[PDB]
Design a protein around this ligand. Structure first.
Ligand SMILES: Nc1ncnc2c1ncn2[C@@H]1O[C@H](COP(=O)(O)OP(=O)(O)O)[C@@H](O)[C@H]1O
Ligand SMILES: Nc1ncnc2c1ncn2[C@@H]1O[C@H](COP(=O)(O)OP(=O)(O)O)[C@@H](O)[C@H]1O
Ligand SMILES: O=C(O)c1sc2cc(Cl)ccc2c1Cl
Ligand SMILES: O=C(O)c1sc2cc(Cl)ccc2c1Cl
Ligand SMILES: [K+]
Ligand SMILES: [K+]
Ligand SMILES: [Mg+2]
Ligand SMILES: [Mg+2]
Lengths: 308, 308
């Protein structure tokens, strides 16, 4: 089973030798990908790269490269176990990176000449980071013995169930802010189950659901106690999984339409939900498409390729 | 009120002088547009242009140019009235032109080197023809005194009502072929009324409805007596009119997706419905977009700009 330019190992050897193979693989893969991202930071427009917060993330990436390269060759389970400590630390050290980049770039990007430069930098940086985090988490998860998982790969993911999980989460945030939340109905292939990697859905779904719920409440300020449902349709075929999220939140206005996919743009939480979700979907071989019915609502279509 | 590179006059003079102005306008506009299309025929790949049916349409276009240019200057109501006879004849003489081109091109296009050449020829020819027919019909309709119309412009078009008209039509064709037809529900801005030109909708709507109904029946061969509804949503805003037509007919397969917009392509009536509808929508400043949920259904979105 694989993803773009990387593979997620589904080993299961008794002596635990698959952990050594996995670890050695990480050590030959992660430093290269970190190095590529450091180059990304090096080539940022000077005035952006000088931003203290951007510099901090840059330094963090240098540190990560240094720590991995300083780690001795993995020869035994004792080494592998310490390697896992390093991986856990880095995952934790880097958990706020998306937020730091958003902040650092927010002001600094208003300065430079080329406007698609930041978009390209963020698309490339955030997707490479997702890949890095997936590989690292997969390696850790190989030690686990949860049913239905091989590392971070779920062998029988139910899209309805993971959708429901994020629905409950988004409904709670929405209720806290507006005193109510749209109900969500789910239809189509509600009983589908198939091998799949949850992690990208764990980012994308709450972003799209928050969007749809905010849009619904903000357009029904007179009747917060009675708002139209959000309707989610699951289509599962041999090629891809499609999740359509349809709201009656009034639509994306014509004057806003060409901006909603830009990092930082927002009508309101830092305006990253849509461009990030799209970059993730595309990184994984899928896509994220919007259909705006101005005056009525929006349909968002998430497509993710099935596992090979 | 206007459309691309042409205007539809909303005159109403008592002496009937607006009919003379309209007629003179046609005589200074139509011959030019016919001449442009004749050039189109002249530049067709030799082997296609030699097809007897293509030659017939070519000749028909030459004849139309010849008749209009042979018609004397319009100076009085007596002239204008005879001019209307000529216009009616030509409209009638040319009513099968789309069908003739489809047939003539069907075989001949398999020969030539450039594959997007025919697509371009048909997009340009069919849209210029729609423009010609709109102008000509508008001029004729100026003699009429129907309530709510100025020529072919409806001053208070109800999208729900025109949708319902074509729904009944498509349901009857479908019922005759399959012994039943999906019901259609219409929601969103069901009470919208606004100035609008019906003619393009009169072509596009039945094409999209036939598609959705065929797809629905062909995927429910076991239960023809109980098939899922087609659902149409109307969104009316200050910029455009959006009509979403959503079916549970199983979707457009991945292997077919990149072909359904090509003239001539069909899984079955001559495979012109979709590319023609899209060319018309775009000619008028709108668009036609498809979202396929393979295994479930298809959403088709027709957008047409409001009148200026
Ligand atoms: N379902 C929706 N309905 C209406 N507007 C939306 C919807 N989803 C996104 N938007 C618009 O696109 C903008 C960008 O969204 P996003 O990238 O998620 O950033 P944020 O939600 O933080 O503003 C939103 O501020 C909102 O104006
Ligand atoms: N709503 C739909 N659902 C499934 N397939 C569709 C739908 N609309 C169009 N298609 C597919 O696209 C093809 C092209 O349609 P069209 O251009 O209207 O030509 P025709 O209907 O004559 O085949 C159809 O044959 C059908 O396979
Ligand atoms: O930026 C990030 O989120 C992460 S997590 C992470 C984990 C490892 Cl083991 C190495 C680099 C790295 C980076 Cl860079
Ligand atoms: O091709 C067609 O449909 C038509 S209708 C029509 C009507 C007039 Cl008056 C002139 C040309 C012309 C053509 Cl070309
Ligand atoms: K945004
Ligand atoms: K076609
Ligand atoms: Mg958001
Ligand atoms: Mg058709």
């Amino acid at each position: 089973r694989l993803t773009p330019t990387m593979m997620l190992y589904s080993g299961r050897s008794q002596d635990g030798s698959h952990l050594l193979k996995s670890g050695r693989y990480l050590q030959q893969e992660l430093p290269v990908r970190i190095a590529h991202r450091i180059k990304g930071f090096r080539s940022l427009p000077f005035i952006i790269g000088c931003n203290p917060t951007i510099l901090h993330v840059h330094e963090l990436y240098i540190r990560a490269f240094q720590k991995l390269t300083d780690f001795p060759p993995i020869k035994d389970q004792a080494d592998e176990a310490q390697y896992c400590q390093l991986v856990r630390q880095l995952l934790d050290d880097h958990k706020d990176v998306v937020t730091l980049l958003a902040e650092g770039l927010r002001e600094s990007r208003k300065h430079i000449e080329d406007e698609k430069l930041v978009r390209y930098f963020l698309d490339k940086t955030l997707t490479s980071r997702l890949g890095i985090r997936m590989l690292a988490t997969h390696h850790l998860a190989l030690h686990e013995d949860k049913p239905d998982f091989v590392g971070i790969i779920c062998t029988r993911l139910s899209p309805k169930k993971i959708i429901e999980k994020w629905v409950d989460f988004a409904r709670r945030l929405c209720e806290h802010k507006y005193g109510n939340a749209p109900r969500v109905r789910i239809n189509g292939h509600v009983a589908a189950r198939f091998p799949f990697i949850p992690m990208p859905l764990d980012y994308i779904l709450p972003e799209l659901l928050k969007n749809a719920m905010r849009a619904t409440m903000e357009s029904h300020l007179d009747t917060p106690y009675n708002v139209p449902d959000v309707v989610i349709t699951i289509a599962n075929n041999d090629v891809d999984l499609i999740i359509r999220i349809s709201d009656r939140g009034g639509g994306i206005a014509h004057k806003d339409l060409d901006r909603v996919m830009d990092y930082h743009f927002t009508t309101a939480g830092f305006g990253f939900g849509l461009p990030t979700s799209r970059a993730y979907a595309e990184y994984l071989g899928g896509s994220l498409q919007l259909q705006s019915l101005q005056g009525i609502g929006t349909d968002v279509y998430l497509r993710l390729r099935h596992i090979d």
